């Protein structure tokens, strides 16, 4: 299990103050959102809708302050690169904590990108940074004088873990219960001598899945069309894996579905 | 030109408030306060009249980095000349430096005293207050990993602050107060 936060701050030069958007996840389940464009911290999962109104006021306050720090950060970042006023720029930050089978801390992380490019990251020891470039060395130097590394290490080792374990208890019936996929295979003719076999995985949580096509039990890693795992909208995920086979050799192909919410892998076969 | 004064002073601690007082001999019925810096602004205030002094008290709210910079005030009768620039700094954003005196904090009148501001943090610059108008760039890293500057200097309590060249109006937490006794 993990808890991750994603900040996206985007300057709107001459179109107002920078837009700050934040989202919080617990594994693959979003639970909170914030948009500076009456900016309010808002629950997106029912197991945080059960925190009180003082939790949420505190949350909102930190959010609106992160939006004001990001607004200054983007004003500094443009200065570091001698970038003009007119151009829109992006500041992203992802941070959070993983937990091990003991329900305690495995690793903490905190990484930032400027216009999509790595910028500064907190090293694993949670005491130092790596600076991607010479602009990010000014930021490292300020964060070190700020004594930030400790603030973060107290977050990642303490409050990040304590609230993940509280979230996971509050959502045990949703968050601690893998949903295995519902699978079927479809079939389509392809030109005169070929045919598409499509292996479907639907309604599965969490999103980690492996679909594999086997010819006589041989992995068809090449010549397999694998679509990106996609959100369904109801909290579950979808993925399909197609393969183009010769007409009349369809019976040699098996689809294999691996998902942690399954006590045996699923093997599928289109039969006519 | 009008006068612009910070009360209690132009060094504002983060999350604290300062008042800029704009006042003139000419009777202006409005006052303008303009900041130039990272984020610019213009503040409009009606203007109190008492004994031929026209005055307005701009309140600069919980000090944040965007409120720091160079303020000017103007008066209009419906714009006057600018009031001389007033640099308002934010302090307390970074760890505080150490302030020393060679030969020692207590000297006799006539002995030259020097102050050394130093830190393990890589401040580019160091500021000497007592009110502040002394800036000496840092030198370092020293073998210790220290960045340090020296202020060759009757009597008073001294503080020193670090800052970085990119943000000249953003200073460290104040150093502990050092009292120079000139006996």
């Amino acid at each position: 299990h993990s808890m991750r936060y994603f900040y996206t701050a985007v300057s709107r030069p001459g179109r107002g103050e920078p837009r700050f958007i934040a989202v919080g996840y617990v594994d693959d389940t979003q639970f909170v959102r914030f948009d500076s464009d009456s900016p309010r911290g808002e629950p997106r999962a029912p197991w945080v809708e059960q925190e009180g109104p003082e939790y949420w006021d505190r949350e909102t306050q930190k959010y609106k302050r992160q939006a004001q720090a990001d607004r200054v950060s983007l004003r500094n970042l443009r200065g570091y690169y001698n970038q003009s006023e007119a151009g829109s720029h992006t500041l992203q930050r992802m941070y959070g904590c993983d937990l091990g089978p003991d329900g305690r801390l495995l690793r903490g992380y905190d990484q930032s990108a400027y216009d999509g490019k790595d910028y500064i990251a907190l090293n694993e020891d949670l005491r130092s940074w790596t600076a991607a470039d010479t602009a990010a060395q000014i930021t490292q130097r300020k964060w070190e004088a700020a004594r930030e590394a400790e603030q973060w290490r107290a977050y990642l080792e303490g409050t990040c873990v304590e609230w993940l374990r509280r979230y996971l208890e509050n959502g045990k019936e949703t968050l601690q219960r893998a949903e295995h996929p519902k699978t079927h295979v479809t079939h389509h003719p392809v030109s005169d001598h070929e045919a598409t076999l499509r292996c479907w995985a639907l309604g599965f949580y969490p999103a980690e899945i492996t679909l594999t096509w086997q010819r006589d039990g041989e992995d068809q890693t090449q010549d397999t069309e694998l679509v990106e795992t996609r959100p369904a909208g109801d909290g579950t995920f979808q993925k399909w894996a197609a393969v183009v086979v010769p007409s009349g050799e369809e019976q040699r192909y098996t689809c294999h579905v691996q998902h942690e919410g399954l006590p045996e892998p699923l093997t599928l076969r289109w039969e006519p | 030109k009008p006068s612009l004064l910070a009360h209690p002073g132009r060094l504002v601690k983060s999350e604290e408030t300062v008042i800029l007082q704009c006042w003139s001999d000419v009777r202006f019925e409005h006052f303008l306060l303009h900041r130039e810096g990272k984020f610019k602004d213009t503040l409009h205030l009606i203007g109190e009249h008492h004994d031929g002094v026209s005055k307005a008290n701009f309140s600069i709210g919980p000090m944040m980095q965007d409120l720091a910079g160079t303020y000017r005030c103007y008066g209009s009768v419906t714009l006057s000349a600018p009031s001389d620039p007033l640099d308002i700094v934010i302090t307390g954003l970074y760890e505080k430096p150490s302030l020393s005196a060679q030969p020692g904090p207590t000297v006799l009148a006539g002995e030259s005293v020097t102050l050394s501001c130093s830190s393990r943090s890589s401040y580019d610059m160091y500021h000497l207050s007592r009110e502040a108008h002394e800036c000496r760039f840092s030198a370092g890293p020293k073998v210790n990993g220290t960045f340090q500057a020296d202020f060759p200097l009757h009597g008073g309590t001294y503080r020193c602050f670090g800052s970085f060249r990119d943000s000249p109006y953003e200073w460290s937490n104040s150093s502990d107060p050092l009292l120079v006794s000139v006996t």
Partner: peptide
Amino acid sequence: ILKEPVHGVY
């Protein structure tokens, strides 16, 4: 819970 925005200005 959110990380407290202390002095994290870049």
